[PDB]
Amino acid sequence: SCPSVSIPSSDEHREKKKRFTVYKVLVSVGRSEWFVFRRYAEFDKLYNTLKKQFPAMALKIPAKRIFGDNFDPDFIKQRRAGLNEFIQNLVRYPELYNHPDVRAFLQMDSPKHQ
């Protein structure tokens, strides 16, 4: 079927002198569903790759460079919203959800999903 996606939540991880937010993406294709876990940088690489290959789609992603606390929960919430709208637009077009970089991002061809 035509895939459906959402980004319901995010989680903070830390290592030493370091933190990062991990976005939980629910991906549904047909009668099945799974979880993909993506950092903003992973959305961004995809956005940059596809904005060049599909200019007229006027792809939009939330801001990359933040002047302020990039771990403000208000900020992360707005960012998640923007990323959700980003990917949810991606899966509307078969030109996109048959794109290899998109299918890998959402793990649409992993053998683990049967």
Numbering used by the authors: 6 to 119
Publication text:
The Phox homology (PX) domain was first identified in the NADPH phagocyte oxidase complex subunits p40phox and p47phox, and has since been found in proteins in every eukaryotic species from yeast to human. Despite relatively low overall sequence homology, PX domains all possess the same core fold, consisting of three antiparallel β-strands (β1-β3), followed by three α-helices (α1–α3). An extended sequence traverses the protein between helices α1 and α2, termed the PPK loop as it generally contains a conserved ΨPxxPxK motif (Ψ = large aliphatic amino acids V, I, L, and M). Side chains of residues from the β3 strand, α1 helix and PPK loop together form a binding pocket for the headgroup of the canonical lipid PtdIns3P.
We have also obtained two crystal structures of SGK3 and SNX23 (for which previous structures exist), as well as a crystal structure of SNX15, the crystal structure of SNX32 (in complex with a peptide from the bacterial IncE peptide) and the NMR structure of SNX25. The remaining PX domains all bind to a broader range of di- and tri-phosphorylated phosphoinositides. These interactions are shown to arise from the presence of a secondary binding site, centered on a semi-conserved His or Tyr side chain in the α1 helix, associated with nearby positively charged basic side-chains. Interestingly, many of these PX domains show a substantial preference for PtdIns(3,4)P2 (e.g., SNX1, SNX2, SNX22, SGK3, and p47phox), although the functional role of this is not yet clear from our work. When the secondary site is present with an intact canonical binding site then both PtdIns3P and other phosphoinositides can promote membrane association, which will likely contribute to overall membrane avidity.
